[PDB]
Symmetry: D2
Subunit: 386 residues, 4 copies
């Protein structure tokens, strides 16, 4: 049933199937995976590519000899499978030197080091073929109010992203940045907590065009927000450069369940939106196989991610294609939302008696929107009871 | 103790002390207040001004005769007290014609009417002296996913705000707009749910400079976000045109408690920020006296709003002025966050061996940030145990 | 297909399809429904019965002849359709006199009135054949800490429930009580906020056997709790006397969406539990059709409530009947969970060297739980992908 | 000043100041603390005692001579300082074998091992003079619906607690059990998620009197519940055997901030309740110093825990002692809440015409509760503004 193909553009980070199971209250339940074995098993599952943090490929502290060998094995696995590397990122959160941040650490020397660690991995990403470079500022923030002046930390954050933009422009590299928002965890509150904050920030950068967002399903759901609405605003702004798919069941710690789990109706409305907007980037899964699972449970969770996307794609396409749904969208006046409010400008509007003086407000008030019927047709499609 | 003065710029909406107590499960517990009596009692309490929605001043459905009289009584109360009207807004949410929105209603004729109702009140606000005009799109959103295409609704929302901007520019009016974000209630999800989303949106308008945000304490706390951080990003972007103060105790329905209640530490860090950034606009309270109270409980809740602001102002000023706190900020390296990461550009950074090759990552990793000590000094100041 | 018949025990409150659309920020969008027309329209939809608050059937302040006339015409609608009244309840939250509670109001005279209003409706409910009497204390609680001494409020709440138990026992009525928990709204915090708190409270009443819980889907989800887990504990305790079914999309105000909407996977696991535990009570819908809808959208939403329960009933039955799922459950050792840990007793467990000193901890640690495979079979069944 | 002395019963877990800073996204930022140095540094801070998990004092897999040696040097640190051990607990969550639970693991052999690991530490705790034995089932739960049959898991959980009760009773040990509830983390949902669910469960055990609750501030706040209300119900039930004090800033991952931080007003109302109810147990701090801190920030955070409890103790005592507050409480009729509703009985209440037919409902509806004035007196006392 529903098999992944390379044209579905499913990708996974080395850190997702590679998660060993270490959590705040417990030790690892799985052995470390070799990146080479991960590229091979994912190519067998039907994935199109893999992503990585620098510390997933090259152990922190590796000499340039050991680094070369790691990179070399990895590149041989890719070349043998035809797997691509669409995106890459830096780990600016695991090592204790980043306990107060990377780009917005209060210590200047830590900020400089964070920038050098990042530029080094940007050079590697570009030769491996990555066209999107992701920044998740997991340690940028605070647990207490005087620990961080946020206006000055946004200057430092703007300064870091402007220097990265200056560096790829002078190298003539074809790579764009995507900021990944998260409202909290591991910091009490993280800077640029949602898609909207990250979008507003990009507009204050010296080269706005170089930067977009990499929203994640479970991160906007950790603030109780509607992830399809956030994604529609990122698409409206032209800034959906990448997306991270997974599941989350409410406002609690960051779960990273496989895609489809968590809020199932929101995953349906997200696939419907991505598919009807013709989003063309990777469908990247950033999930963690639960630590209850062994390695077979890992590849079953990874396969379940892609399967759930393909079943929802099919139900959504069937929803939109149904004549009765099309008729119900006309009835709920979704065609009329697409017509301009006042295409002849404000002076026509002002002159129009029917827009105010003679508007029958109670006739209009009494029209039913027919939204429940439309939503129960969407329910029957999702459940295949239509 | 702590008496409000006109220079504190405390303002209140007619709808706040005027709330009759009607809620989703219950009828009104208080009689309607006359606007004239509200201007007089608030001037006696030490408030500086009042704000209003059009339907708070002039009953929906009033003829231009009855409208004139309402406006006339109101203006006499203001002139007699010296009360100002700093801001005004439209009610695009109470009447059943707005059940699916005002500016983003699916029905085109409702959107045109919403625009005419708004322009009419913009003319009144400007003659009363309002310099900020607030838009709270309470009904813009949905309870179900196919009921609203969000990309098209943002076109309609951009179109409405661009027409309002064209109208005040051609009239030569000195009035700016402030968008008030709210994540949900009364709609399942409201469009532009947080400060960040509202900030990002403004940047796509034809005249960005005309528009800023009016954030509300309890609204960003309904998505579990840190309100002082959201306000610091609005100030960093130059867009804090106005602010609404109240309290909220967590992620639940919108409470509108008096300012100081709810998250007390966040109110302290907010006053500290507003006062040290030299914000100069109104300190507006948008709160609801609980329906358990009679009219004396109403003016006690309203007075408590201003009192709590003045006690926190004093504790914050004392925190920042203390030599021991200043020494603790140097120790947590808050002065170093203010220094540029790499003011000699990316090529100096790249050349610098000490930024990477020779950086002693474990010496840096081992420096303690001394944040708990700094936060316990902030705790002793707030509690006056210092 | 999925057509409801009275055999399915689907019931609806008069206040559900009869909600007019008045919310915290808006007026009514629909006309009041006559109880008589609600009884016949629901009988046609396939419903089994209706429930009521005293003030839904008899307008507050009715003279006893008007009271009698209302009951009389209701009773004849019931008799002509074969509709039943399984449950009734009291409105102790709408009138201004209940602004601080009914049974735990600080004013003693109000607490005596609340008990007399309730006893009058217990006599009426027993005459119409109600077997469960629900108590939703929506006004028992507080917005501030010193307003309510909670240990004393629980003494007053125990006092009220013991007096109602004494009353129905002296009348020899065959009726039982079900407490409906809600964490908040309309009070800042409500007493007995979840299923667990209501279950613990019942054990301290004089006649515990007379009382159980009426959990509501959306109420436990407002505290972010797992509603199928909460129902499993109420069933394990033998106290699930009734249930209210609806949808909620996260921690926010109380939405009362139609059942199936909100968290769809929790609706599936709930039906799987009710059906396999053999719950025999009413499947009651306490939902509110959105105020965007006219009277036709009202009956469409009500009909979708029943349709979604019947589609999920079928997918849950198919899931459990599948040999491959049955095999997946043995693989995840759900059969072993049913075996007693130590039926051999404590001294045999203590003498058992294989339970401790010779237990191979690393061999057990390495067994995967196979939970993700199992959950994807559940997902495939829910979506009809098998 | 606010100096802690052993008379204040302040206790700390070895795992609290001993947390190394390893979190879901990062490695340790601090070295392990020796138990012996923790006992003496806390005795100097004014603490009264320490608590431990078996694996905090004796590293997992210690041979019995290494076990004996660890206990021996711990016991001599204790004896030299006069420090006590009021409470102990078992670690049934860290080792990989507990990845599906201890007492409710699907594997039966793991459940027998979990009981043997616990009985071994009950013998040790009683030798060191512990009177309360805490059980925090952090791994009892699930991330998916079919993984755990919750009615059967509660049978296994009852079975485990009844076997521990049989064991301490046959040993004639004077020790009682306290269940610590948490809604989630590290499992998607944890069994017995709140105080109420643990209280209800206890009533179904064989010897209910042997068991109570150990509520934690931050755990109930992760479900958005009012922690002082939850403690008032545990005290009303006579089951508050122990308490864990810390801070949490909302519904998100579990922070374990120092007490006083997070929701400051709930910390004030909590201390007001513990002190006026006369709670006599340990004021235990289960918090984690942020990983931004070195060992000096660790002892500063621990010291702030005790300081904040003593400042709030003083403000709560001053609030209740104030004649003006005492007068405000009569005005809000908190004296009337203490009067029985109907000590005259049901037939006298039924015959009482002033309770219903002659009750003036509109006169009672009009009495304001004066709760906002009262809450602002509380606010003034908390901030030391009076
Ligand atoms: C470990 O996953 C990270 C995340 O989402 C945090 O919740 C990011 O995906 C990573 O930094 C690269 O983007
Ligand atoms: C009734 O208060 C409103 C609000 O905040 C909704 O939660 C706005 O303040 C009003 O529309 C003017 O801004
Ligand atoms: C409006 O419905 C009520 C409720 O749940 C509100 O949250 C109860 O269902 C009713 O009082 C009887 O159960
Ligand atoms: C790390 O501490 C534990 C906990 O609360 C985690 O949420 C318990 O306190 C401990 O197992 C004994 O009570
Ligand atoms: Mg995540
Ligand atoms: Mg991610
Ligand atoms: Mg509000
Ligand atoms: Mg507002
Ligand atoms: Mg509800
Ligand atoms: Mg209900
Ligand atoms: Mg905790
Ligand atoms: Mg604890």
């Amino acid at each position: 049933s529903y098999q992944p193909t390379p044209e579905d553009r499913f990708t996974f980070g080395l850190w997702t199937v590679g998660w060993q199971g270490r959590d705040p209250f417990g030790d690892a339940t799985r052995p470390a995976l070799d990146p080479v074995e991960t590229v091979q098993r994912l190519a067998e599952l039907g994935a199109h590519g893999v992503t990585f943090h620098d510390d997933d490929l090259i152990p922190f502290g590796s000499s340039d000899t050991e680094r070369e060998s790691h990179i070399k094995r990895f590149r041989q696995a890719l070349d043998a499978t035809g797997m691509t590397v669409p995106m890459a990122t830096t780990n600016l959160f695991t090592h204790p030197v980043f306990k107060d941040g990377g780009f917005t650490a209060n210590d200047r020397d830590v900020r400089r080091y964070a920038l050098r660690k990042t530029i080094r991995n940007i050079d590697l990403a570009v030769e491996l073929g990555a066209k999107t470079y992701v920044a998740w500022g997991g340690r940028e923030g605070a647990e207490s109010g005087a620990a961080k002046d946020v206006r000055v930390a946004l200057d430092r954050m703007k300064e870091a992203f402007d220097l990265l933009g200056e560096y790829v422009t002078s190298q003539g590299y074809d790579t764009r940045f995507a900021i990944e928002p998260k409202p909290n965890e591991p910091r009490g509150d993280i800077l640029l907590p949602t898609v909207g904050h990250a979008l507003a920030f990009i507009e204050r950068l010296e080269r706005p065009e170089l930067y977009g967002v990499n929203p994640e399903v479970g991160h906007e759901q950790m603030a109780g927000l509607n992830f399809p609405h956030g994604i529609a605003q990122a698409l409206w702004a032209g800034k959906l450069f990448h997306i991270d798919l997974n599941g989350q069941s409410g406002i609690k710690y960051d779960q990273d369940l496989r895609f489809g789990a968590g809020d199932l109706r929101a995953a349906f409305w997200l696939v419907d939106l991505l598919e009807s907007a013709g989003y063309e980037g990777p469908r990247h899964f950033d999930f963690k196989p639960p630590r209850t699972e062994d390695i077979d449970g890992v590849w079953a969770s990874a396969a379940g991610c892609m399967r759930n996307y393909l079943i929802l794609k099919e139900r959504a396409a069937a929803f939109r294609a149904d004549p009765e749904v099309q008729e119900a969208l006309r009835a709920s006046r979704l065609d009329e939302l697409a017509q301009p409010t006042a295409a002849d400008g404000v002076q026509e509007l002002l002159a129009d008696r029917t827009a105010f003086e003679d508007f029958d407000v109670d006739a209009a008030a009494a029209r039913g929107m027919a939204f429940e019927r439309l939503d129960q047709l969407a329910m029957d499609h999702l459940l295949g009871a239509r």
